[PDB]
Design a protein around this ligand. Structure first.
Ligand code: CDL
Ligand code: CDL
Ligand code: CDL
Ligand code: HEA
Ligand code: PC1
Ligand code: FES
Ligand code: CU
Ligand code: ZN
Ligand code: ZN
Lengths: 63, 7, 147, 73, 99, 100, 57, 230, 50, 59, 50, 196, 89, 76, 281
């Protein structure tokens, strides 16, 4: 997984858009979240595990 | 139905 | 090597002339030749695998014995046992049974011993005359027919 | 608040008590009554992580296994 | 000899039950049709079917039932005593069931 | 100000500190939930939470699951494993890929 | 020209004037049907591009 | 389905034989019988008979397209559920063959609703075939062309049969050549085109040699054209 | 049809179908909306003429 | 059962077996392919009446 | 059965019993051994693989 | 109800009883129930999935990939002819299969595969005094009950066909060999007791 | 007599090789009866060195009726109280 | 016994490196012993342990066979 | 023709024809229980390794962007792609591949992207590229296992669910010449092996391709914003940084836990018997 790059994030590969609207999600303080970079995750914005099942260099952003 | 005949 | 009979099994074409392809007594039986070949090859292959696996296991154990252990230079209680040692805070009232499954499994099935835990061998048991002498004599005395 | 957290924990406790009693019943059914376990749709519930396969295991009979349920209803 | 394994025995048990299930399908349909048999309306065409209960005496039925239960019990005794009895000693039971 | 460490996976890098955190949170939760039983019992790494015959209590273990979730910020799957000892809690915590 | 796996004969392609001709010598040699000697070469380890990269059509 | 329905037809025909030759008056109204019972029994057998005739051809198309498209079928579980739902609902629609015999209006409404709802399991099959025909490595074969002909014929037949459950139309279209066209398109065209698709798909397995393309193409063209024109 | 007739044969850009099994998001729900509407239509019309 | 091997790698028809990937003095023109002996589709096996009757005969 | 003392000493000196017997026959007493029935199983070549 | 194998079991009954009482992988693989074959691991080069054949050069094998809990099969059922001689793998999922051609022997190599077989069920062995249960709820899953007991004092000894013929047609030789084998059984039991 | 498969298959000396060297296949030594699990849940976690066997036992099965009756008295009295309360109100 | 845990981790890391170098491949699991709590056997969530922050990170090859010498030596 | 044959008329020797001595029986039992027995098959996966070679790299000679670009240009024509990649370049992209393999790969009909990708796969998985595809086995691959045995694996020719469509042949040819009246000649059933979930292994046979096709069917009709137009260096989120957040209390607690003599100190009773315990109430 890749760290949170503070406003400077170039995708390693072209991701699937998977929606043109941002999610409005309640994040708990101090809890580690994995963000889906590939875009093919079934579990909404979060990584799930499908980045390992697609040919991409987009790794989850653990923040 | 509702607008099956369309006119 | 003290647990196993590592004696290679000779092909029947040596002792018996009707298996020898150039002995003028040869009986060209495809199925019997295949059976002899497969039995001899399987036995010798198991012996060779046993030897090679034992050598590989010795190599791996030698690697593991001499490897550096950086956790012995860490902070006690974080990456090492505490300075006092290992303690037992229970108050047993009777002897623990020898049939506990967890201790046996943790000492028996290990990844380090992977190279010898599945090596098939013939145990070094005492020979039986009716089975290791008389039966081979009976097998080798079978009459054969080319017809 | 704290009362809501206590209610949530109690609900989880009830749910897990039911789940684990049911799982004990299912494990006993699989071990002692393999054919009924297969008929009811119970998975092979013996942990074979030690590498030795179970002596009496079976293929899953998932008869019941959306639209079909709706239209049948 | 050398043919009647466990698979063959199970096959013949299945064959028996399959035959009797097949024969019990058409009979089941006929019995269902017999239960709700068609009739004329009760008002003017068929005013008497109210009193046609078609009830048969149970005492006569019970005296009818004797030979069938007799052969059932004799067959069970024949199969139970096959463990310690010979063929000529069981010919009595076999002949009685035949008669 | 103490800057948090950049390198991730610090829970797995300090087994002793992870076990200490597990022991602390489990002890606090068990003393709060069942004071009449666990207020005198020291909780160490070999302490289990079953009966003398090996029978486990689901309520106590779910309380321990909640304590571990709040302590480490994880989501313990209650249907996959039941925490009946500190060793099981250690295995669950160190198996999770996002403990903190 | 083998387009998409089907060979086609006598296919005309166009290079527009409003296009950047990097390496004019190599472009001229390729268009004029020359086998270019690339013995004097270096390799640039620049992983800038990506698959299906946006290109302003 | 045949195991379920065969005893009913057997009982009906045995009763007909007894009525013909013993004068049991099973289907004579004068002294208790009712002629409608014969229609009920026969059609309770009969609609499942058409379903058992048609479903294996659905099986035939679902094998050729994945074989030639080099990809998995769109969703095999949903197709299996669709055919099973059609089989289960085929036992509650026989009365659409007896709309005009004077059934009670509750029965007609039940039969019509369940018959019209057959269109939803059948549309799942068509959507799955269409989705299995896309995004793959296609190899054009004579079984594939026969499958396409089956697809067209089945579409037309199913739509026309769905129209027949519209009760007001069915009153005018009962026992007419519209029904003949519906079920002939379906049975003859779709079923025999699927059977021919299986014959060409299993030609080496059945005959040990590979088939000739010329007369096979002629067979395809002429059979499909004849079905439509007829 | 156009796609499968123009770009799915082996010589015209085939696809490497790497999916073992399908994973769907309410499949039949989309495939049954169009038929259900039809049913509604038919039912309504019948009722009127009835 | 059939065990003959009548298929193997075929080169020097249009793609040469030699190496001219970097050869600047050689251009490969596969349209100049030379005629070879036509390979007919495999003929199916033909029965031997006497052999088949003898082998399938049962005493 | 009676096993000679010298033979037992020879066995104990030559072979040291380090593992247990997995055969359940080890539990049988001499009363139960005498009640066993010796059945024979003809072992010939096998041609049927089902 | 248990067959007197001395006089009745000759070829297939005899082989079935051998499979029951010896659990030899060859015999046990011949008579393994078609209903359930023991679930195995996932084939890898280090730990190949072993498919057994009783002295046959090949076997048809179908692969559905890495089976999961959500869907019982990984990929589509792909069939192939697993042959004898080397490891072979399914290119779709990479599962490596090894064909083990079991031999009719008592070698330690065969005993290595002793844990890959379900033990042979004894319920259908022998002769049944009940045809079939008429209960629909318990049918095709339960076996038929018996009015008799199953003896447990049978010790099976393998004989050659020639020796079995002589045993059948020569009662004196049969009694002699039986008493010799009883003495051997006494000796073997005493040896096991001393070892324990 | 075995309860665990890893103990059953660890070192078995009753294998067909040895039993054929003696050629006495007793019926009581069928492998159908040799091993049998405990019918109580037993799964595996990862301990400190290897797999650890954890047993999940939830409720006993030897309960007698007196326990059920004594544990039901409050429920029965609650039912009586609620029914009488409904009658009065 | 923290020494038991650390020794198990070290042994399994050395075994993974040795086997990967022998087979000219990489480890498949990075989990010392397979247990079903992560469901990684049949799901897509790997237990791979490769964490680094840039191309200059010294700890980039930790957990991979490239971290070991041809003598299976822990460093370089 | 050959005459009648009854195999039961000929003696077979599977059991020794003499009985063991009593002393030999006792000695054999003693001997077999004095030494370990032969091991029995264990199906646990000890140290699984990737079946498809090392996982592709983020950056290097060959990465995953190359694999994607390979996907988006797939075609199977009736003629070769006579454009040959340089064998030196193929060797450079896949460092361990030999000259002969690179040249032979260039002599196949793949487009240069597919040539380099095939070279990568063949080198990583140990594939034998000189193996001619037939209806017995479609591929051959020599790989050394964890015991260093250097085994070979033969990728068979398969059929889609239909044994009737399976080419049951024993020749290195593509035709279906053999027709069997009895498919299961010896009555041995075919098998579909079920895998135990506990004994499964994580998918490593090109695991990164399971969703590939799906994604590549969605990205073919997707237009991506060029990096010239994508906004960059946007303001950082106030509550997020590259270092995972730890509260100062948690950091202090870990610092305290570093000490060896750490105990909770918040208990009501002196449960740890610490000499320096002060009751907090
Ligand atoms: C439909 C019933 C209700 C409506 C009223 C019907 C009135 C019928 C009157 C005429 C028949 C009177 C009795 C005739 C003699 C019965 C002979 C006999 O051996 O019966 C017992 C016999 C049980 O022996 P079994 O099946 O070997 O026992 C298997 C298990 O050991 C034990 O298996 P189990 O514990 O599951 O029980 C098996 C069996 C137990 O049997 C009963 O309880 C008898 C019930 C009446 C049986 C006949 C009903 C009509 C069948 C047509 O129960 C059933 O079969 C279902 C009840 O049952 C039958 O013969 C039933 C046959 C039909 C089964 C399907 C029914 C639907
Ligand atoms: C989907 C939604 C799922 C969630 C829905 C919400 C929760 C519903 C379930 C509530 C609950 O606590 O269930 C747990 C309850 C088990 O009780 P527990 O609290 O786990 O037992 C604690 C000790 O293990 C107890 O073990 P022990 O052996 O020490 O104690 C004896 C124990 C032995 O265990 C059992 O009997 C459990 C049987 C199951 O029996 C009892 O304690 C129960 C009987 C007490 C006397 C009668 C009480 C009054 C009865 C009503 C008034 C009189 C009429 O499970 C069930 O009621 C069903 C379990 C699954 C049955 C088979 C399904 C296939
Ligand atoms: C009162 C209402 C409130 C009750 C409150 C307490 C509830 C819990 C009680 C204890 C449950 C328990 O765990 O018991 C231990 C018991 C231990 O059984 P086990 O030793 O494992 O035996 C294995 C089978 O369960 C063995 O099962 P099985 O095949 O032997 O029997 C089937 C089993 C199925 O039960 C269940 O599935 C649970 C219900 O039981 C029944 O079907 C019982 C009803 C039928 C009785 C037939 C015999 C008597 C007939 C005549 C009665 C009339 C009076 C005759 C008077 C004679 C002249 C004076 O646990 C279970 O059976 C597991 C399920 C527990 C209940 C889950 C819900
Ligand atoms: C196997 C052949 C077969 C099949 C599959 C069907 C299928 C169907 N049949 Fe048919 N039918 C017969 C054979 C068959 N039938 C026969 C032989 C008779 C004569 C009985 C007698 O003599 O009385 C008969 C009679 C019959 C009747 C009575 C006619 C009359 O009383 O004489 C009715 C309507 O009540 C009917 C309806 C249907 C319906 C709704 C379906 C449905 O299952 C069809 C399902 C298909 C769909 C509904 C999906 C369509 C797909 C699309 C996506 C539609 C869109 C396409 C376009 C718009 C072109 N059938
Ligand atoms: C294949 C099976 C087909 C189905 C067969 C079902 C048969 C019916 C069985 C169930 C209903 C029985 C109802 C009986 C009602 C009697 C009412 C009455 O007044 O009777 C007085 C009558 C009076 O005698 P009677 O029978 O002569 O009647 C007087 C004469 N008529 C008919 C004109 C009224 O009967 C008796 O007093 C004696 C018999 C009593 C009834 C016995 C019933 C037995 C029921 C169970 C049988 C099966 C057991 C299986 C066990 C396993
Ligand atoms: S699926 Fe997007 S990073 Fe995992
Ligand atoms: Cu109909
Ligand atoms: Zn049952
Ligand atoms: Zn597969």
């Amino acid at each position: 997984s890749i760290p949170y790059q503070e406003g400077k994030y170039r995708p390693a590969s072209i991701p699937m858009v998977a929606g043109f609207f941002p999610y409005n999600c309640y994040l708990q303080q101090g809890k580690v979240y994995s963000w889906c970079s590939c875009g093919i995750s079934q579990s909404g914005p979060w990584c799930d595990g499908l980045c390992n099942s697609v040919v991409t260099r987009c790794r989850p952003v653990v923040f | 139905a509702l607008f099956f005949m369309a006119n | 090597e003290k647990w196993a009979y590592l004696d290679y099994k000779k092909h029947p074409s040596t002792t018996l002339s009707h298996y020898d392809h150039k002995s003028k007594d040869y009986v060209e039986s495809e199925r019997d030749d295949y059976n002899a070949d497969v039995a001899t090859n399987s036995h010798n292959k198991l012996i060779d695998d046993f030897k090679r696996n034992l050598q590989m296991q010795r190599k791996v154990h030698d690697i593991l014995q001499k490897m550096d252990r950086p956790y012995l230079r860490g902070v006690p209680g974080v990456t090492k046992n505490i300075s006092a040692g290992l303690q037992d805070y229970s108050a047993p009232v009777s002897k623990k049974s020898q049939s506990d499954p967890n201790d046996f499994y943790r000492d028996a099935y290990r990844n380090e011993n992977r190279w010898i835990d599945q090596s098939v061998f013939t145990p070094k048991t005492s020979k039986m005359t009716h089975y290791d002498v008389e039966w081979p004599k009976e097998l080798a005395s079978r009459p054969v027919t080319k017809k | 608040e704290e009362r809501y957290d206590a209610l949530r924990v109690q609900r989880r406790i009830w749910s897990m008590r039911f789940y684990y009693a049911r799982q004990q019943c299912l494990y006993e059914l699989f071990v002692d009554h393999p054919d009924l376990a297969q008929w009811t749709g119970t998975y092979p519930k013996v942990d074979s992580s030690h590498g030795f396969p179970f002596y009496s295991t079976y293929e899953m009979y998932r008869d019941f296994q959306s639209f079909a349920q709706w239209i049948t209803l | 000899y050398s043919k009647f394994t466990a698979a063959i025995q199970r096959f013949w048990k299945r064959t028996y039950i399959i035959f009797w299930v097949i024969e019990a399908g058409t009979f089941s349909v006929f019995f269902y049709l017999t239960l709700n048999a068609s009739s004329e309306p009760v008002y003017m065409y068929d005013q008497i079917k109210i009193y046609k209960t078609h009830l048969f005496s149970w005492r006569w039925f019970l005296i009818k039932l004797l030979p069938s239960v007799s052969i059932i019990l004799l067959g069970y005794y024949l199969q139970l005593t096959l463990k310690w009895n010979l063929f000529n000693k069981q010919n009595t039971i076999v002949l009685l069931i035949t008669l | 100000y103490n800057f948090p460490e950049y390198r991730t996976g610090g829970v797995q890098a300090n087994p002793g500190i992870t076990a200490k955190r597990i022991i602390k949170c489990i002890g606090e939760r068990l003393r709060k939930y069942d004071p009449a039983r666990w207020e005198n019992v020291p909780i160490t790494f070999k302490t289990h939470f079953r009966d003398e015959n090996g029978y486990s209590d689901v309520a106590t273990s779910i309380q321990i699951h909640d304590a571990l979730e709040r302590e480490f910020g994880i989501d313990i799957k209650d249907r996959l494993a039941l925490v009946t000892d500190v060793e099981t809690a250690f295995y669950i915590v160190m198996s999770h890929h996002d403990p903190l | 020209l083998q387009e998409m796996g089907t060979t086609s004969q006598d296919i005309v392609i166009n290079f527009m004037k409003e296009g950047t001709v990097h390496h004019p010598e190599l472009f001229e040699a390729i268009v004029k049907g020359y086998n270019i000697d690339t013995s004097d070469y270096v390799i640039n380890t620049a992983n800038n591009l990506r698959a299906r990269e946006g290109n302003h059509n | 389905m045949l195991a379920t329905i065969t005893p009913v037809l057997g009982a009906a025909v045995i009763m007909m034989a007894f009525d013909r030759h013993w004068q049991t008056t099973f289907f004579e109204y004068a002294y208790g019988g009712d002629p409608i019972l014969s229609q009920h029994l026969f059609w309770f057998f009969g609609h499942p008979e058409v379903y058992v005739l048609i479903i294996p051809t659905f099986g035939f198309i679902n094998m050729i397209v994945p074989h030639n498209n080099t990809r998995r079928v769109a969703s095999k579980h949903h197709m299996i559920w669709a055919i099973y739902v059609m089989a289960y609902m085929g036992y509650l629609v026989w009365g659409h063959h007896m709309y005009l015999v004077g059934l009670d209006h509750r029965s007609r409404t039940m039969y019509s609703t369940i018959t019209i709802m057959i269109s939803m399991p059948a549309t799942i099959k068509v959507v799955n075939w269409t989705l299995s025909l896309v995004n793959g490595a296609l190899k054009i074969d004579l079984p594939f062309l026969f499958s396409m002909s089956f697809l067209l014929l089945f579409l037309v037949a199913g739509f026309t049969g769905m129209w027949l459950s519209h009760v007001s139309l069915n009153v005018s279209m009962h026992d007419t050549f519209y029904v003949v066209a519906h079920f002939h398109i379906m049975l003859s065209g779709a079923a025999m085109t699927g059977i021919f698709s299986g014959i060409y798909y299993y030609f080496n397995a059945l005959f040990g040699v590979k088939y000739s393309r010329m007369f096979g193409y002629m067979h395809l063209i002429y059979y499909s054209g004849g079905q439509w024109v007829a | 049809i156009l796609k499968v007739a123009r770009f799915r044969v082996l010589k015209m850009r085939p696809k490497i179908s790497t999916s073992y099994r399908p994973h769907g998001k309410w499949g039949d729900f989309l495939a049954c909306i169009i038929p259900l509407i039809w049913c509604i239509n038919i039912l309504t019309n019948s009722n009127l003429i009835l | 059962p059939y065990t003959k091997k009548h298929d193997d790698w075929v080169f020097d028809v249009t793609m040469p077996s030699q190496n001219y990937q970097t050869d600047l003095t050689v251009n490969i023109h596969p349209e100049n392919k030379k005629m070879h002996v036509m390979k007919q589709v495999m003929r199916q096996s033909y029965w031997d009446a006497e052999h088949d009757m003898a082998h399938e005969y049962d005493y | 059965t009676v096993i000679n003392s010298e033979f037992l000493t020879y066995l104990k000196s030559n072979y040291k019993i380090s593992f247990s017997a997995s055969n359940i026959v080890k539990y049988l007493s001499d009363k139960s051994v005498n009640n066993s029935v010796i059945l024979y199983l003809r072992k010939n070549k096998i041609f049927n693989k089902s | 109800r248990m067959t007197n194998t001395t006089e009745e079991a000759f070829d297939e009954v005899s082989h079935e009883w051998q499979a029951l009482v010896t659990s030899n992988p060859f015999d046990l693989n011949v008579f393994n129930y078609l209903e359930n074959t023991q679930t195995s691991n996932f084939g890898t080069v280090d730990n190949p999935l072993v498919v057994f054949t009783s002295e046959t050069p090949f076997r048809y094998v179908g692969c559905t990939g890495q089976m999961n809990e959500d869907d019982y099969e990984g990929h589509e059922l792909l069939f192939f002819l697993l042959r004898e001689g080397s490891l072979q793998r399914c290119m779709g999922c990479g599962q490596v299969f090894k064909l083990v051609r079991l031999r009719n022997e008592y070698s330690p190599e065969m005993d290595y595969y002793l844990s890959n077989f379900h033990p042979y069920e004894m319920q259908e062995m022998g002769e049944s005094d009940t045809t079939v249960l008429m209960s629909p709820y318990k049918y095709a899953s339960h076996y038929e009950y018996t009015q008799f007991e199953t003896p447990s004092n049978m010790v099976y000894s393998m004989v050659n066909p020639d020796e079995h013929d002589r045993l059948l047609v020569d009662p004196a030789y049969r009694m002699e060999r039986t008493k010799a084998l009883e003495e051997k059984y006494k000796v073997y039991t005493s040896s096991l007791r001393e070892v324990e | 007599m075995f309860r665990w498969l890893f103990l059953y298959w660890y070192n078995s000396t009753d294998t067909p090789s040895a039993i054929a060297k003696v050629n006495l296949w007793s019926y009581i030594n069928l492998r159908l009866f040799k091993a049998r699990l405990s019918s109580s849940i037993a799964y595996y976690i990862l301990g400190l060195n290897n797999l650890e066997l954890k047993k999940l036992k939830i409720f006993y099965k030897n309960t007698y009726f007196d326990y059920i009756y004594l544990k039901s008295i409050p429920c029965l009295f609650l039912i009586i109280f609620f029914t009488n309360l409904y009658l009065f109100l | 016994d923290i020494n038991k845990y650390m020794e198990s981790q070290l042994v399994n890391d050395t075994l993974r490196a040795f086997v990967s170098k022998v087979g000219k491949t990489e480890p498949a699991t990075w989990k010392n012993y397979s247990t079903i709590y992560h469901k990684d056997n049949y799901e897509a969530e790997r237990v791979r342990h490769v964490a680094f922050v840039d191309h200059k990170d010294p700890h980039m090859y930790h957990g991979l066979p490239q971290d070991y010498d041809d003598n299976i030596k822990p460093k370089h | 023709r050959a005459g009648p044959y009854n195999p039961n008329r000929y003696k077979d020797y599977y059991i020794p024809r003499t009985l063991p001595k009593n002393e030999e029986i006792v000695e054999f039992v003693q001997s077999q229980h004095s030494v370990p027995a032969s091991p029995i098959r264990n199906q646990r996966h000890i140290n699984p390794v990737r079946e498809s070679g090392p996982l592709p790299s983020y950056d290097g000679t060959y990465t995953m962007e190359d694999i994607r670009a390979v996907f988006y240009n797939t075609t199977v024509g009736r003629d070769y792609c006579y454009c040959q990649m340089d064998p030196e370049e193929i060797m450079r992209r896949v460092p361990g591949i030999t000259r002969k393999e690179a040249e032979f790969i260039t002599k196949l009909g793949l487009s240069p992207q597919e040539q380099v990708d095939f070279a990568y796969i063949a080198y990583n998985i140990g594939l034998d590229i000189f193996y001619f595809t037939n209806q017995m086995f479609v591929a051959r691959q020599v790989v050394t296992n964890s015991k260093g045995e250097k085994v070979e694996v033969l990728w068979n020719a398969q059929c889609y669910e239909d044994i009737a469509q399976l080419n049951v042949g024993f020749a290195p040819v593509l035709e279906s010449v053999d027709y069997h009246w009895e498919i299961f000649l010896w009555a041995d059933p075919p098998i579909k092996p079920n895998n135990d979930f506990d004994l499964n292994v994580p998918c490593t046979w090109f695991e990164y391709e399971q969703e590939w096709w799906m994604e590549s069917c969605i990205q073919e009709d997707q237009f991506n914003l060029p990096e010239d137009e994508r906004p960059y260096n946007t303001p950082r989120n106030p509550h997020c940084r590259k270092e995972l957040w730890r509260s100062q209390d948690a950091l202090q607690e870990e610092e305290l836990m570093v000490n060896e003599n750490w105990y909770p100190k918040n208990t009501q009773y002196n449960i740890y018997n610490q000499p320096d315990f002060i009751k907090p109430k």
